[PDB]
Design a binder for these strands. Structure first.
Length: 111
DNA sequence: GGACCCACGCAGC
DNA sequence: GGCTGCGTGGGTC
């Protein structure tokens, strides 16, 4: 039974063409595969890839799918390190990214 | 209240 | 006293 989260070759290519780095590709796949976390409710703020820091854990099956697409597209010579040090931190940064930077909230507080 | 990306000091572990 | 994600801010678009 094929998964409904699967992306066509054309869809993957359109995401790759916008990706600045393999880490950014992982983050873009995260947004595409977890739409429920990227609504105006920002449920993403309650999740990270592992459940560390007393947060909820991203669906392990879709996290494996992100890694599958990363490994199907990008170089694999150092894939363990790319996943651990580039893709995982990019995924977590995308979940926790504030809609407004603290320095901008305070800079407007003068206006 | 721009959206977005990634580097990096830090606290908790 | 190293490793893991958070909070943060410089920077590009």
């Amino acid at each position: 039974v094929p998964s409904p989260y699967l992306l066509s070759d054309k869809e993957v290519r359109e995401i790759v063409q916008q990706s600045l780095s393999v880490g950014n590709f992982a983050a873009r796949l995260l947004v595409r595969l977890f739409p429920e976390l990227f609504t105006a409710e920002n449920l993403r703020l309650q999740y990270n890839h592992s459940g560390a820091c007393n947060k909820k854990q991203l669906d392990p099956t879709r996290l494996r799918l992100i890694r599958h697409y990363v490994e199907a597209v990008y170089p694999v010579e150092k894939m363990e390190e790319v996943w651990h040090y580039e893709c995982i931190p990019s995924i977590d940064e995308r979940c926790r990214r504030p809609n407004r930077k603290k320095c901008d909230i305070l800079k407007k507080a003068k206006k």
